[PDB]
Amino acid sequence: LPVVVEAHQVDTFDVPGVFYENHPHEPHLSGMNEYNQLYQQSINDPDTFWARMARDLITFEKDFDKTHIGTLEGGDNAWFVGGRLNASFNCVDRHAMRDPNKVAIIYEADEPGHGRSITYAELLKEVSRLAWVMKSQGVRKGDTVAIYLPMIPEAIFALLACARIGAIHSVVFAGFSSDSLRDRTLDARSKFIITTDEGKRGGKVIGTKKIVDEALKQCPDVTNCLVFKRTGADVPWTKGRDLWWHEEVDKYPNYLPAESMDSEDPLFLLYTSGSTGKPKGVMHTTAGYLVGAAATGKYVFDIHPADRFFCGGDVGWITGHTYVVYAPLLLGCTTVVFESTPAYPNFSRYWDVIEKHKVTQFYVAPTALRLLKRAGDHHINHEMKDLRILGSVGEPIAAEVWKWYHEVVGKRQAHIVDTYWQTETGSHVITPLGGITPTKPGSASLPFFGIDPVILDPVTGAEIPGNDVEGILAFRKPWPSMARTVWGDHKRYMDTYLNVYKGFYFTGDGAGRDHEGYYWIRGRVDDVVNVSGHRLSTAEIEAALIEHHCVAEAAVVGVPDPLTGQAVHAFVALKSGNDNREQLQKELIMQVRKSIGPFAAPKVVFVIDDIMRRILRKILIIDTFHEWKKA
Ligand SMILES: CC(C)(COP(=O)(O)OP(=O)(O)OC[C@H]1O[C@@H](n2cnc3c(N)ncnc32)[C@H](O)[C@@H]1OP(=O)(O)O)[C@@H](O)C(=O)NCCC(=O)NCCS
Ligand SMILES: COP(=O)(O)OC[C@H]1O[C@@H](n2cnc3c(N)ncnc32)[C@H](O)[C@@H]1O
Numbered sequence: 001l002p003v004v005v006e007a008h009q010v011d012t013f014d015v016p017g018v019f020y021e022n023h024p025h026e027p028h029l030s031g032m033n034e035y036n037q038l039y040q041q042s043i044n045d046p047d048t049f050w051a052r053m054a055r056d057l058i059t060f061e062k063d064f065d066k067t068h069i070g071t072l073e074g075g076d077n078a079w080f081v082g083g084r085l086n087a088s089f090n091c092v093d094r095h096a097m098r099d100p101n102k103v104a105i106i107y108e109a110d111e112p113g114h115g116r117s118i119t120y121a122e123l124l125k126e127v128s129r130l131a132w133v134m135k136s137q138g139v140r141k142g143d144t145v146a147i148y149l150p151m152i153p154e155a156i157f158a159l160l161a162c163a164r165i166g167a168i169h170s171v172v173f174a175g176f177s178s179d180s181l182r183d184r185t186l187d188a189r190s191k192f193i194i195t196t197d198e199g200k201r202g203g204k205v206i207g208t209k210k211i212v213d214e215a216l217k218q219c220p221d222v223t224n225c226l227v228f229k230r231t232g233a234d235v236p237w238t239k240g241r242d243l244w245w246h247e248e249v250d251k252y253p254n255y256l257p258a259e260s261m262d263s264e265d266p267l268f269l270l271y272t273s274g275s276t277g278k279p280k281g282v283m284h285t286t287a288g289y290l291v292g293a294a295a296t297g298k299y300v301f302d303i304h305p306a307d308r309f310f311c312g313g314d315v316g317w318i319t320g321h322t323y324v325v326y327a328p329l330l331l332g333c334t335t336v337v338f339e340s341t342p343a344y345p346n347f348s349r350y351w352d353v354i355e356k357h358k359v360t361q362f363y364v365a366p367t368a369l370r371l372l373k374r375a376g377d378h379h380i381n382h383e384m385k386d387l388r389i390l391g392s393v394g395e396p397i398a399a400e401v402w403k404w405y406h407e408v409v410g411k412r413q414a415h416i417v418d419t420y421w422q423t424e425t426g427s428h429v430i431t432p433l434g435g436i437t438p439t440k441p442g443s444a445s446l447p448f449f450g451i452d453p454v455i456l457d458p459v460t461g462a463e464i465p466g467n468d469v470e471g472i473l474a475f476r477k478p479w480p481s482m483a484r485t486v487w488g489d490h491k492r493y494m495d496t497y498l499n500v501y502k503g504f505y506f507t508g509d510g511a512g513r514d515h516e517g518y519y520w521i522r523g524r525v526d527d528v529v530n531v532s533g534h535r536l537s538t539a540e541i542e543a544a545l546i547e548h549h550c551v552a553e554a555a556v557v558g559v560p561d562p563l564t565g566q567a568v569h570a571f572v573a574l575k576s577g578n579d580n581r582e583q584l585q586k587e588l589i590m591q592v593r594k595s596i597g598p599f600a601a602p603k604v605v606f607v608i609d610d611i612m613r614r615i616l617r618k619i620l621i622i623d624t625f626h627e628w629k630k631a
Contacts, residue, residue, distance in 0.1 A: 002468055002514070002515065003468045003469060003470055003512070004468060004469075004470055004512035004513070004514045004515075004520055006442055006443075006512070006520045007440070007443070007512070007514035007515065007518070007520060010440050010441065010442070010443070011440070012438035012439060012440055012516070012518075013438060013439055013440070013441075014438050015415050015435055015436065015437075015438070016412055016413055016414070016415065018412070018413040019388055019413065019414070019415055019435055020435070022385075022388065022413070023388065023435070024304070024306065024386075025304045025306070027302055027434075027435045027436065028298055028299055028302065029299065029433065029436050031436065032436060032437065032438070035433055035436055035437065035446075038449060039446075039447070039449055042449040042450040043450070043452050043477070046067065046068060046450055046477070047066075047067040047068060048067075049449065049450070050067050050068065050079070050080075050291065050450060050480055051064075051067045053291060053295055053449070054067075054080055054287065054291045054480070057291060057294040057295060057298065057330070057331075058085065058090055058287065058290055058291055058294060058330070059085065059089065059090055059094050060080075060083050060084060060085045060287075061084040061085055061086070061089075061260055062082070062083060062084035062085075063082075063083060064080035064081060064082045064083030064263055064287065065081055065082030065083075066080075066081050066082065067079065067080065068478065068480075069081060070478070071478070072475075072476075072477070072478055072498055072503060072504060072505055073498060073502050073503050075490065075493065075494045075498050077478040077482060077484065078263070078264050078484075079263065079264075079287060079288035079291070079478075079480045080263040080264075080287040080288060080291070080480075081263060081264065082263070083262070083263035083287050084260050084261065084262060084263070085260075085261060085263065085286065085287055085290075086163065086164065086166075086258040086259060086260065086261050087160070087163040087261070087267060087286055087290055087326070088127055088160040088161070088163040088164040088258055089164075089258045090290060090330050091160055091163075091325075091326065091329035091330055092104070092120060092123050092124045092127055092160060092329065093124060093258065094332075095120045095329075095332045096120040096121050096123070096124040098332075099120060099332075100119060100120060100121035101119050101120075101121060102119060102120050102305075102332075102334075103117045103118065103119055103120075103334045104118055104119060104120045104122075104123045104329065104334060104335065105117070105118040105123060105153045105156060105334070105335055105336075105337055106118075106308065106334055106335070106336045106337070106357050107152065107153045107336075107337045107339070108336060108337065108338045108339060108340065108353050108357070109200075109339050109340070110200040110201060110202065110203065110339045110340045110344065111200075111340075111345075112345065112349075112352060115339075116153075118153055120332075123156075123157075123160075124255070125254040125255070126153075126157045126249070127157055127160045127161045127164055127256075128161075128164070128252075128253065128254055128255045128256040129249040129252045129253065129254055129256070130157050130158065130161040130245075130249060131161040131162075131164045131165050131256045132249070132251075132252030132253065132256050133226060133243075133245075133248045133249055133251075133252060134161060134162070134165060134167065134192060134226075135165055135256075136248075136251075136252065137192060137223075137224045137243075138191070138192075138223075138224075139165065139167050139191070139192050140165075140166075140167070141165060141166030141167065141259055142166060142167070142168065142265075142266075143167050143168065143190070143191060143192070144167070144168045144169075144170045144188040144189060144190040144269060145158075145162050145167045145168065145169050145170065145190055145192050145193070145194065146170055146172060146181075146184070146185045146188065146190040146192070146193040146194070146222070147159065147162075147169055147170065147171045147172065147193070147194050147195075148172050148174060148176075148181055148193060148194070148195040148196075148208060148211070148212055149171075149174060149194060149195060149196055149208075149228070149315070150174045150196060150199040150200075150201060150206065150208070150230075150339060151201075151314060151315060151320075151337055151338055151339045152196070152228075152230065152337065152339055153337050154196075154228050154245070155171075155315045155337070156315075156324075156325055156329075156335075156337065158194045159171065159268070159315070159321075159325055160325075160329075162268075163261075163267060164256065164258050164259065165256075165259050166259040166261050166265065167192075168188075168266045168267065168268055168269060169267075169268045169269075170184060170185075170188045170190060170268065170269040170270070170271070170281070171268070171270065171315055171316055171320075171321070172184050172185070172271070172316065173314060173316025173317065173597075174199055174206060174208060174314075174316060175314075175316070175597050175598060175599045176316075176596070176597045177211070177593070177594055177595065177596060177597040177598075178211045178212075178214035178215040179215070179594065179595050179596075180595070180596055180597060181211060181212065181215040182214075182215035182216075182218050182219055183271075183278065183279070184271045184279070184281075185215060185216075185219045185222065186218070186219055187271075187278075187281060187487065187488065188269055188281060188487060189221060190219075190221075190222065191221050191222055191223055191224075192222065192223070192224050192225075192226070193212065193216070193219075193222050193224075193225045193226070194225075194226045194228075195208050195209060195212045195225065195226070195227055195228070196208045196209070196227065196228045196229075196230040196231075197209045197227055197228070197229055197230055197231055197232070197233060197235045198230055198231040198233055198235070199230065200230065200231060200339065201339065201340065201341060201344075202340060202341040202343065202344035203344055203345070205231070205233075209227060209235040209236065210235065210236065212225060213236055213238065216238075216241075222241075223241065224241060224242075224243060225238070225241055225242050225243070226243050226244075226245055226248065227242055227243065227244055227245060228245040228246075229244060229245065229246060261286050262286070263285070263286055263287035263288070264285045264286065264287070264288075264484070265285060265286050266283055266284075266285055266286075266484075267284050267285055267286045267289055267290075268283075268284055268321065269281040269282065269283050269487050270282050270284070270317075270318055270321060270423055272318075272423045272424075272535065273528065273535050273536055273537040273540055274496060274508075274526075274528060274537060275496075275508070275526035275527045275528055275537065275539070276527075276537075276539055277492070277539070278540075279537075279540070280486040280487075280489070280492065280493075280496075281486060281487030281488065282423050282424055282483045282486060282487075283483060283484055283485045283486065283487050284426055284481070284483055284484065285484050287480075288426070288480035288481050288482070289326070289426050289427075289480075289481045290326060290330060291480045291481065292426045292427040292479070292480050292481025293322050293323075293326040293327040293330055293426070293427050293481065294326075294327060294330040294331055295427070295448075295449065296322075296327060296419075296427040296428040296431070296448065297309075297323065297327030297328060297330065297331050298331060299433050299434075299448075299449070300391075300417060300419060300428050300431050300432075300433055300434055300448065301323075301327070301361050301363070301389055301391065301417070301434050302361070302388070302389055302434040302435050303327070303328060303331045303333050303361065304331075304333065305331065305332045305333050306333065307328075307333040307334065307360040307361060308333070308334045308336065308357055308358055308359045308360050308361075308386070309323075309327075309328040309333055309334065309335050309336065309359070309360065309361045309363075310335075310336040310338070310353070310354065310357075310359040310361065310362045310363065311323040311324045311328075311335070311336075311362075311363040311364075311391075312338060312342075312350070312362070312363060312364040312365070312368065313363070313364075313365070313393070313533075317423075317534075317535075318422070318423040318426075319363070319393055319394075322426065322427050323363055323391075324337065327427070336353065336357060336359060338353060342368050342371065342372060343371070343375075346379065347372060347375040347376075347379040348379040348380065348381075348382070350362070350364070350368075350372070351379075351380055351382040351384060352382070354382065354384045354387060355382040355383060355384050358385075358386045359384070359386065359387060360386045360387065360388060360389065361387075361388070361389035361390075361391065361434075362387060362389070362390060362391065363391035363392075363393065364391070364392065364393075365392065365393055365394045365395070365532075365533035366392055366394065366395050366396075366397045366398075366401055366533075366565065367394070367395075367532045367533045367563070367564060367565055368533075369392075369397070369401050369404070369405055370401060370562070370563050370565075371563065373401065373404050374563070377404075377408050380408055380409065387410065387413075387414055388413065388414050388415065388435075389414060389415055389417060389434045389435075390405060390406075390409065390410050390414045390415065390416045390417065391416075391417045391419055392405070392416065392417065392418045392419065393419050393420075393421070393533075394530060394533040395523070395530055395533070395565050396418065396442045396443075396444075396520070396521060397416070397418050397441070397442065398441070398442050399441045399442055402416060402418075402441035402442065403441070415432070415434050415435055415439075416439060417431055417432050417433075417434050417439075418431065418432065418439070418442075418443065418444050418445070419431040419444070420444035420519070420521050422507065422508075422509075423483070423535070424482065424483040424497065425479070425481065425482060425483075426480075426481025426482060426483065427448075427481045428448050429447065429448050429451045429453075429475070429479070430444040430445070430446065430447050430448065430451065430453065430519050430521075431444060431445065431446075431448055432444075432445040432446065433446075433448075440514075440518055442520065443514070443518045443519065443520050444518075444519050444520070444521055445518050445519065446517065446518065446519070447519070450477070450479040450480065451475060451479055452475055452476040452477045453473060453474070453475055453476075453511070453513075453519060454474050454475070454476050454504065455469045455470065455471045455472070455473065455474075455511060455512070455513055456471050456472040456473075456474050456501055456504065457471050457472070458471055458472050458510075458525065461501045467513055467514065467515050467516070467517055468513070468514060468515050469512065469513050470510070470511070470512035470513075470522075471510065471511070471512075472501070472506070472507075472509075472510060472511070472525065473507045473509045473510060473511035473519075473521070474501055474504035474505055474506050474507060475504065475505040475507070476503075476504060476505075478505070482505070483497075508524055508525060508526050508528065509521055509522065509523060509524060509525065510522035510523060510524075510525045527539060527613075529557075529558030529566050529568055530565060530566055531558075531561075531564055531565070531566055531567065531568050531599075531600070532564050532565070532599070533565075534599055534600070536568065536600055538556040538557060538558065538568070539556075540596060540600075541554075541556045541568065541570060541592055541596065541600060541602060542554040542555060542556050542570075543595070544591055544592045544594075544595035544596055544600075545570060545572050545588060545591060545592065545605070547591055547595055548572075548587060548588055548591045550574045550575060550576065550578055550584065551572045551573075551574060551575070551588070552572075552573050552574060552575040553572070553573045553611075554570065554571070554572045554573075555570070555571045555572075555611055555613060555616060556568055556569070556570045556571075556602065557569055557571075557613055557616045557617045557620070558617070559617060559620045567603050568600075568602050568603065569602060569603060569604065569606070569616075569620055570588070570592075570602040570604070570605045570606065571605075571606045571608060571616060572588060572605055572606070572607060572608075573607070573608055573609060573610060574607060578607070581607055584607065585604070585605050585607075588605045589601050589602065589605060606628060606629075608621075608624070608625050608628050609621065609624070
């Protein structure tokens with residue numbers, strides 16, 4: 001009956017009464033009334049609103065002159081212009097100064113019962129002397145630094161040592177292949193790379209040093225490669241280029257000055273798959289990104305200094321950037337660096353970790369939940385008394401999963417916060433406010449401060465006003481943590497995000513606003529599919545399949561999946577007869593595993609004789625492929 005069909009007979013659930021009774025502190029807003037009043041000031045007077053929020057949350061060396069200049073259509077937005085600051089001062093120094101022995105990082109190793117806790121003073125030392133290593137090898141303010149690290153505290157050391165000297169960290173997910181590492185290191189023109197000898201994830205060795213050596217053969221501008229001894233296994237060593245982390249840091253002082261950065265100096269690049277082309281180097285600058293990180297960490301996740309915050313995402317992706325690293329450290333609480341998987345050594349792992357370290361907020365993807373919900377409710381017998389916020393990212397936590405998350409995991413004592421955002425937005429843009437906003441299962445609820453969502457007619461591009469509407473999801477106004485460009489290709493940035501509907505920011509997502517104003521994300525309207533919370537281009541995989549000598553044309557599409565959410569399925573037509581078609585589905589799968597990485601391997605590759613991508617999506621020579629699907 002309603003135009004937003006996902007919103008038929010879905011009421012709001014209030015924040016549970018237990019949330020306030022057991023809360024160790026006072027929440028940051030007095031209620032929905034204060035959200036609405038702050039939200040309206042953030043739309044009608046962002047200059048006043050964001051100036052106060054930034055001076056509340058971020059310590060500037062030099063105060064800023066003006067909250068914002070530029071427009072969406074101009075592609076010239078700058079926030080807190082005239083300000084100077086350093087992101088690692090804000091994540092480390094100011095907290096070490098006040099409370100040197102407060103724990104900043106809880107590292108949880110691949111094996112239980114290992115790991116360690118790291119104080120803000122220890123973090124300041126490790127950031128400083130790693131920054132010393134890079135400066136000593138020639139890394140300067142404004143250079144990019146490639147980072148190919150797993151989930152160990154050393155990764156936080158590396159991002160923040162980069163920020164400390166004004167280098168621009170460019171993190172590459174440790175599940176990427178050599179080709180993908182190479183592409184990103186070249187496009188970013190990094191001359192320094194930081195990696196491990198090997199990874200350990202779920203009991204499994206990841207030959208990270210061997211991958212780096214292969215990529216580096218095609219990166220002749222990389223002149224130093226700093227290697228952290230994670231396992232101590234014999235790895236290949238290239239003298240005059242490779243350096244041991246532990247040998248070099250021991251040479252240098254335990255303190256280094258922080259470099260004074262402009263508000264709009266680049267902070268990092270994060271290569272991101274999109275609808276067309278190779279991955280884009282999404283660039284975030286410094287003050288606005290950090291303001292958005294801290295403001296969502298504070299208001300969305302109810303972070304207080306004493307909290308122990310646990311994001312489950314990998315540092316290789318934007319959730320790891322913003323909520324494993326920047327948001328919790330800016331706010332001065334403790335952050336958990338989880339090296340393992342939710343299934344190692346067993347399916348109780350997430351809750352082993354949450355009970356041992358008394359985690360207050362946990363932040364995960366629905367893929368992980370579905371993998372766990374199928375494992376059974378018996379892997380979950382933990383008190384976890386301090387756990388009051390349950391975050392979800394990447395896709396709608398649907399009703400069955402949202403119930404299992406609320407009752408079995410949270411014991412109806414925690415608030416579930418379905419945060420909608422994307423790499424380009426820097427931090428949450430549509431999300432309930434932890435402990436404040438009444439929620440609906442499967443809805444991202446309401447916009448964050450400074451976010452002005454509109455629903456657009458997909459064809460005419462016009463604004464569809466009022467409630468119970470559906471169409472393209474766009475934002476009407478700029479916001480502090482928006483991405484500022486695509487590295488080396490601002491026109492692509494304009495063409496992708498700002499020239500599609502001039503005057504608006506184009507999210508790439510379809511959405512609907514229900515009778516109450518709550519938003520329901522329908523997913524991508526372009527050829528980006530979300531597999532296991534990993535953001536993938538169907539074009540990228542098609543490009544990888546064509547890299548096989550037998551493939552002529554290739555086509556990849558995304559069909560709904562009960563565990564992976566969406567399952568990538570590939571089709572390929574061969575140039576010549578393959579007498580071993582069974583052997584070919586192995587080499588085509590390995591090809592994608594080599595061009596991108598294991599995590600992008602298609603489920604099955606179909607071979608047919610003979611682009612209307614929509615027909616393949618609805619099916620999973622038109623009658624011949626329907627028989628082909630049946631096999
Ligand atoms: C749920 C999850 C833990 C499953 O882990 P998994 O057991 O490795 O299974 P996956 O399907 O994801 O990965 C398949 C392949 O990717 C590889 N892979 C995944 N993560 C990797 C990593 N961090 N490093 C190296 N390789 C990785 C696996 O080893 C595997 O390779 P293989 O086929 O040779 O064995 C993982 O997919 C995940 O983290 N999803 C969440 C994404 C997200 O939204 N995070 C934000 C959370 S706030
Ligand atoms: C993590 O940011 P990424 O850039 O990896 O993801 C970018 C892409 O994820 C999707 N998405 C993220 N959160 C939600 C969410 N709560 N609900 C629904 N869909 C979501 C969306 O399609 C976005 O365009």
